[PDB]
CSV table of C-alpha atoms in Angstrom, one decimal:
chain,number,residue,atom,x,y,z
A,4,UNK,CA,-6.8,-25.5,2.4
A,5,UNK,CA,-4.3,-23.7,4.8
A,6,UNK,CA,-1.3,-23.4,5.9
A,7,UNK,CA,-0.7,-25.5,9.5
A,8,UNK,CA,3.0,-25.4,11.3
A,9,UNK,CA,3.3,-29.3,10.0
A,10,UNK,CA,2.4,-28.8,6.6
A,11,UNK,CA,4.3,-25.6,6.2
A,12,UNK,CA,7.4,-26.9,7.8
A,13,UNK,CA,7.4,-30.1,5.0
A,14,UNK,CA,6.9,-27.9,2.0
A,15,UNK,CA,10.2,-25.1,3.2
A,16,UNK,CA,12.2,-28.6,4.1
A,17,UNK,CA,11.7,-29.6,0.3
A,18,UNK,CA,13.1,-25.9,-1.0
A,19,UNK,CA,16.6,-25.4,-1.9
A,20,UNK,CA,17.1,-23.1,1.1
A,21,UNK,CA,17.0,-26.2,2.8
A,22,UNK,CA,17.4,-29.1,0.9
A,23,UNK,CA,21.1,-27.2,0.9
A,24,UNK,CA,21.6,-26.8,4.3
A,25,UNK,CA,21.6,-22.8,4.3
A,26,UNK,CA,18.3,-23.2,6.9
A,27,UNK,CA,17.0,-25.5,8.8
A,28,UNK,CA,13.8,-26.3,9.8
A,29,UNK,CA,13.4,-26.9,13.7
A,30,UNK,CA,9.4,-28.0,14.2
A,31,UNK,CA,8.7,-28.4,18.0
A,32,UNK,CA,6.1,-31.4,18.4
A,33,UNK,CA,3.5,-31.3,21.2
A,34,UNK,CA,-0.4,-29.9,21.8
A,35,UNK,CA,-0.2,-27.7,18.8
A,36,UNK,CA,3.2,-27.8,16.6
A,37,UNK,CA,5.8,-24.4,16.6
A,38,UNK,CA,8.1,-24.2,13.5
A,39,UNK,CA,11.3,-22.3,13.9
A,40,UNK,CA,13.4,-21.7,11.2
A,41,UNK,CA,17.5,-20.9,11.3
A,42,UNK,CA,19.2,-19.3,9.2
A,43,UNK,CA,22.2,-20.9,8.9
A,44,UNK,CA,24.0,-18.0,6.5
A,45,UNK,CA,22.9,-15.4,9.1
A,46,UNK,CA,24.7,-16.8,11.9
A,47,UNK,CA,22.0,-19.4,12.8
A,48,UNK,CA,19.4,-16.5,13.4
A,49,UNK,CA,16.3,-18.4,14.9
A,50,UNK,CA,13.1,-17.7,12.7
A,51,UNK,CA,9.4,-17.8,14.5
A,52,UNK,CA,6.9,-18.7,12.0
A,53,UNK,CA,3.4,-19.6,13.5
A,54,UNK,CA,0.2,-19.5,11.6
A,55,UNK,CA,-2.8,-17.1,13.4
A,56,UNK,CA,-5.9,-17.6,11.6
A,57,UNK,CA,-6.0,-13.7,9.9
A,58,UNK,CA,-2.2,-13.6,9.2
A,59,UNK,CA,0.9,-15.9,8.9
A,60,UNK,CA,3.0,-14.3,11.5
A,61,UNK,CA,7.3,-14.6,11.4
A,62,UNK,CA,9.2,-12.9,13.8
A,63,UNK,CA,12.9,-12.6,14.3
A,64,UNK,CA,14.4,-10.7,18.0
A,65,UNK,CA,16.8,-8.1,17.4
A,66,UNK,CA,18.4,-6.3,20.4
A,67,UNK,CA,17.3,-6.0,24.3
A,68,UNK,CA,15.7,-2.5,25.0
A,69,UNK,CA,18.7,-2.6,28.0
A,70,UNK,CA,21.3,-2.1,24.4
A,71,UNK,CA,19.4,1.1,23.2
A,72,UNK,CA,21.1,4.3,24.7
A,73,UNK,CA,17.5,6.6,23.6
A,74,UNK,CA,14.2,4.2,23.8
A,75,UNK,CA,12.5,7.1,23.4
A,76,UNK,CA,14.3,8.6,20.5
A,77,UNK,CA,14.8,5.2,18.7
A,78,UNK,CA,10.7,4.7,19.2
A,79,UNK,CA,10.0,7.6,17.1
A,80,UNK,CA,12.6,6.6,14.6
A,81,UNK,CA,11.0,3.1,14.3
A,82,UNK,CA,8.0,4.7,12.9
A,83,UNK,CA,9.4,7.1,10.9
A,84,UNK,CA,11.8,4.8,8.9
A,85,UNK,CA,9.1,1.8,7.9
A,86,UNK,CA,10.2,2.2,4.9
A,87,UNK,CA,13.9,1.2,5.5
A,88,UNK,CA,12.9,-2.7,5.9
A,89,UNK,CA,10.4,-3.8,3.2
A,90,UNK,CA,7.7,-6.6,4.2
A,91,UNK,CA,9.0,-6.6,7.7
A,92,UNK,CA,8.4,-4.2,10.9
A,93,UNK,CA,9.8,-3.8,14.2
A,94,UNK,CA,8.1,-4.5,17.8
A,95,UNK,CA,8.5,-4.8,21.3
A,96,UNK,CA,8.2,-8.0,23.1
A,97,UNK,CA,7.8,-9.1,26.8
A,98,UNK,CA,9.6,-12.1,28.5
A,102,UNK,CA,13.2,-8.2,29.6
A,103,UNK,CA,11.4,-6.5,26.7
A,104,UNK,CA,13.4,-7.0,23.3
A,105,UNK,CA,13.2,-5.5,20.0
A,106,UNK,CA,11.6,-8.1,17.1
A,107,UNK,CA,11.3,-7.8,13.4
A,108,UNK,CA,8.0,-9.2,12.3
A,109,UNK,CA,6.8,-9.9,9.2
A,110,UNK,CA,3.1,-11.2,8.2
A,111,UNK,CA,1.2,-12.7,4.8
A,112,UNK,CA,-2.3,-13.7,3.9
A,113,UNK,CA,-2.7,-17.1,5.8
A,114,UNK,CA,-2.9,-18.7,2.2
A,115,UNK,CA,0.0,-17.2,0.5
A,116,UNK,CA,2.3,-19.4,-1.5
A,117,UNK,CA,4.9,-21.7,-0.6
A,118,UNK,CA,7.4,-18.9,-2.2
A,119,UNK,CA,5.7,-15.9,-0.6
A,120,UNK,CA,6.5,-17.2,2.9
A,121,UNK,CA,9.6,-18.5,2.0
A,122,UNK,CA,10.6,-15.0,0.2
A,123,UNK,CA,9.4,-13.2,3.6
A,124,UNK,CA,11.6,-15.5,5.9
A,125,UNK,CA,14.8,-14.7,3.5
A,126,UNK,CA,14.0,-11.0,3.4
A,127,UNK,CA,13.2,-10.5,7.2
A,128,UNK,CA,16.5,-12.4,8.0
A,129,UNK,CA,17.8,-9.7,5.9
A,130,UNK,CA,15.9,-6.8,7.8
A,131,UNK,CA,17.5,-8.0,10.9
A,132,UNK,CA,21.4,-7.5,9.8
A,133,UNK,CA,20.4,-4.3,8.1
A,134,UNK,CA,18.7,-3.1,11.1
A,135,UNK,CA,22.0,-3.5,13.1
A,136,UNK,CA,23.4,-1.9,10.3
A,137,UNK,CA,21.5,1.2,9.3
A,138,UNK,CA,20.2,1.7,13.5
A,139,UNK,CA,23.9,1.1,15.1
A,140,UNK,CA,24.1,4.6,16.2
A,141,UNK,CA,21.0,4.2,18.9
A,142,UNK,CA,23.0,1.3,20.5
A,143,UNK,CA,25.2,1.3,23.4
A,144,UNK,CA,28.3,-1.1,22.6
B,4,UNK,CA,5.5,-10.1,-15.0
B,5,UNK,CA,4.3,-7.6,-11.8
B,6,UNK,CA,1.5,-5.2,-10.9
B,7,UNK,CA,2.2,-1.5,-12.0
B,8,UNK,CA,-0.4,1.3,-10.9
B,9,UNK,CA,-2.1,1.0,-13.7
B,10,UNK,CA,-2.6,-2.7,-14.3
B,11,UNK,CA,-3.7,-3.1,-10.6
B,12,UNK,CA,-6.1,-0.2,-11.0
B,13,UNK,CA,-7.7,-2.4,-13.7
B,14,UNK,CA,-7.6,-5.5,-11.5
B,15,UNK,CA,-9.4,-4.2,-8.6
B,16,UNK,CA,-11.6,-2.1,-11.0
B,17,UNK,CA,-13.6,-5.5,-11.6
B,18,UNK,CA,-14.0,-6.9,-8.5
B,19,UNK,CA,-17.0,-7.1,-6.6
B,20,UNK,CA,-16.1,-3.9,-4.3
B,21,UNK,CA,-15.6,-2.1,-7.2
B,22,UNK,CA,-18.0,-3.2,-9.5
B,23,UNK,CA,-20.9,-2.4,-6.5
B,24,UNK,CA,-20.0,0.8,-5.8
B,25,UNK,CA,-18.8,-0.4,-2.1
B,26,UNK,CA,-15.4,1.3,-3.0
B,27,UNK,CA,-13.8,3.2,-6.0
B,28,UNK,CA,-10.4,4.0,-8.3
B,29,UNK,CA,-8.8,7.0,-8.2
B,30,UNK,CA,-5.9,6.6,-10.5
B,31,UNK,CA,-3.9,10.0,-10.5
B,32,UNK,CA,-2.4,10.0,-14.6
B,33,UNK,CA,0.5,11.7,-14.7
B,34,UNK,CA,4.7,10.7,-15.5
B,35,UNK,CA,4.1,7.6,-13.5
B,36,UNK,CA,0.5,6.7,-12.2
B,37,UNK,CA,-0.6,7.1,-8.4
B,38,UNK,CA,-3.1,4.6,-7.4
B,39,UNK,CA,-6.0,5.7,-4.8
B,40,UNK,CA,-8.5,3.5,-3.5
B,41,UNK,CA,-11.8,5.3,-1.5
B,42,UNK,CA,-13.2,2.8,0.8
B,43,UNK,CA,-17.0,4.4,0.7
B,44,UNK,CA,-18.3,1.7,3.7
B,45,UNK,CA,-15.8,3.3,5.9
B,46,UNK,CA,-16.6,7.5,5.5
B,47,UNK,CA,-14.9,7.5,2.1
B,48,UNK,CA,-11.4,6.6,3.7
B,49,UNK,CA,-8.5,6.9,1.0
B,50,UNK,CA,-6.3,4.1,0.6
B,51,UNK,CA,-2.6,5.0,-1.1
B,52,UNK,CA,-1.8,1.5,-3.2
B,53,UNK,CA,2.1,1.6,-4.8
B,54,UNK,CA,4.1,-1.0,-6.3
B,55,UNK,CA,7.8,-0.2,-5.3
B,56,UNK,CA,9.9,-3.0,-6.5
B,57,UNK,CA,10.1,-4.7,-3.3
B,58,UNK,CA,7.0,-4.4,-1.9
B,59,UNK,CA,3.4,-3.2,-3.0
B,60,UNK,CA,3.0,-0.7,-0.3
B,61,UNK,CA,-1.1,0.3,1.2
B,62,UNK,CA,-1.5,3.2,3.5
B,63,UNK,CA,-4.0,5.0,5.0
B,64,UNK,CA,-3.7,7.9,7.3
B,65,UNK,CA,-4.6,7.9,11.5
B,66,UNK,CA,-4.1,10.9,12.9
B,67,UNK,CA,-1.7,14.0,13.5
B,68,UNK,CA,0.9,13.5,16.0
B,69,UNK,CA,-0.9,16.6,17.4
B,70,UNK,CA,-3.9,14.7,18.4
B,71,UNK,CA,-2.2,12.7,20.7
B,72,UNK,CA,-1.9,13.4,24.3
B,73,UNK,CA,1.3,11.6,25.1
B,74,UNK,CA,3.4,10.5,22.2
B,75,UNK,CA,6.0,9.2,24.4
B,76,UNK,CA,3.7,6.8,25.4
B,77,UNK,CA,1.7,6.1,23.0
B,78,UNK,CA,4.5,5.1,20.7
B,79,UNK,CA,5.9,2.7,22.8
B,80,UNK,CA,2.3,1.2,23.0
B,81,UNK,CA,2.5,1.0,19.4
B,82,UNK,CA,5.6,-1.5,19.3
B,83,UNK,CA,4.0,-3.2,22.1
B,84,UNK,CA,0.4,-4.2,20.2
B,85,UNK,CA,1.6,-5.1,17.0
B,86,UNK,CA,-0.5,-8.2,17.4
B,87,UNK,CA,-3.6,-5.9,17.4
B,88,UNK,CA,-3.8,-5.1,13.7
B,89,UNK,CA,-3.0,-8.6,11.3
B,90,UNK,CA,-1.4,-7.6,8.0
B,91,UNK,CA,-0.6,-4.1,8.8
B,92,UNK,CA,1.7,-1.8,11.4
B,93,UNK,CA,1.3,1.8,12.3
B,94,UNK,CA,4.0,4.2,11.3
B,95,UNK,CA,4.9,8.4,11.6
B,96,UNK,CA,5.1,10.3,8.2
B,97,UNK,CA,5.4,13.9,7.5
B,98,UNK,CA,4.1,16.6,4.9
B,102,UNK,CA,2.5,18.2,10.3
B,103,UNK,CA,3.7,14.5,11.4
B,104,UNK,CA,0.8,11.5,10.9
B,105,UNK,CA,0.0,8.4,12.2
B,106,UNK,CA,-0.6,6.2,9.3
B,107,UNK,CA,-1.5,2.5,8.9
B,108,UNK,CA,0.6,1.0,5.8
B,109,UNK,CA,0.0,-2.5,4.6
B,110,UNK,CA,2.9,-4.5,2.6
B,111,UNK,CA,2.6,-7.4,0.2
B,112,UNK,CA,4.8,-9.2,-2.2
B,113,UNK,CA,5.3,-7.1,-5.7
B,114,UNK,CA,3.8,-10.4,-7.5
B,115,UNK,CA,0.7,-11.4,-5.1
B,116,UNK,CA,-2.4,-12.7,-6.3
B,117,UNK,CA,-5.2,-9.9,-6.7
B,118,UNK,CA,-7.2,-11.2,-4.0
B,119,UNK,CA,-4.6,-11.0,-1.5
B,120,UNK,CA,-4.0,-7.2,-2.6
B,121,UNK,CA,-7.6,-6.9,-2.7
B,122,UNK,CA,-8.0,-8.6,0.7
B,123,UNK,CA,-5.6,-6.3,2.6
B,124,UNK,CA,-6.9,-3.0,1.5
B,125,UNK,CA,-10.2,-4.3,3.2
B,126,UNK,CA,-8.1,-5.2,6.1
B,127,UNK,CA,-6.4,-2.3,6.6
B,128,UNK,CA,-9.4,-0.2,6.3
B,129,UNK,CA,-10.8,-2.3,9.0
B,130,UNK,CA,-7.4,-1.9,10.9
B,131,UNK,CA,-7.8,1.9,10.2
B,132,UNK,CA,-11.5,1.7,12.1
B,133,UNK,CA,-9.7,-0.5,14.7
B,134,UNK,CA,-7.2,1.6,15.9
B,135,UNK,CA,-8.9,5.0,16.4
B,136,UNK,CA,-11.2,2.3,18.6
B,137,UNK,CA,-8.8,0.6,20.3
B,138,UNK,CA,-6.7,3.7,21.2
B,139,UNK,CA,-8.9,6.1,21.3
B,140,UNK,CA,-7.8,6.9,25.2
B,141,UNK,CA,-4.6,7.8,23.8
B,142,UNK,CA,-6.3,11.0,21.6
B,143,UNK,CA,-7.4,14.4,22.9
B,144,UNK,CA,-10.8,14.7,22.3
């Protein structure tokens, strides 16, 4: 009737992504249940998909703000460019604060919406190093 | 196969927000269609709804840049509450810079999950100028 971080992690372990070995799924047990997933083809990039009631949420870190030379500049170009990386946009997080690319869907979506949205925000997350290399330091 | 301006203009045509006046079409004809949605329960606010081949895009303007006191600031604010608005993220666009609020959903979603986050970002839209209204001028 919706998706839960148990019964979401069973359906994307029986998808070919998977059931190849190109991602893994990496369910943490306890109170409530946090599914990771890693992308094995994107050098193991570690995948936060959590459930939230209004919205499926997955988010993916990018860079430390300590690697951008201009936050300033590079804020305003964040929101000037959302339509660089389709389905997915950047944030800032707290622990040192650190770019993420998040992505969200309707907390029923299909079993191949979410799984297309992980795919495409793993993606996102090289092209952002790609197409944003200028703003960073090294 | 996939929603086109046209076809989802029919969908949402016959739904119950349409169908009770509580919102309407505005489908701009021309070489290829534009799709407008007016959300009447929220001051006749104009929702821009296009299908671009990897994403169907929904957007709705803020603000002008102008209207806020410290952009600096407030972008940085902006990467930092992403968690504020589910399903949608603010973004800058230009014709004088705007603050907009854009939506994205896969190009084959069901029609009440494209239905479901126009409402939501209309809501979101409400949201924001009440959330951040200490940000704005007057």
């Amino acid at each position: 009737r919706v998706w839960n971080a148990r019964s979401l992690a069973e359906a994307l372990s029986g998808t070919e992504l998977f059931s190849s070995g190109e991602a893994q799924i990496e369910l943490i047990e306890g109170a409530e249940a946090s599914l990771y997933v890693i992308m094995r083809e994107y050098g193991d990039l570690p995948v936060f998909v959590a459930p939230q009631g209004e919205q499926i949420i997955v988010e993916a870190l990018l860079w430390p703000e300590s690697d951008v030379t201009d936050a300033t500049a590079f804020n305003e170009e964040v929101l000037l460019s959302r339509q660089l990386f389709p389905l997915s946009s950047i944030g800032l997080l707290n622990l040192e604060r650190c770019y993420s690319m998040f992505g969200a869907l309707s907390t029923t979506s299909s079993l191949a919406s979410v799984l297309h949205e992980i795919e495409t925000l793993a993606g996102n997350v090289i092209r952002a190093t790609e197409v944003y290399a200028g703003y960073l330091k090294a």
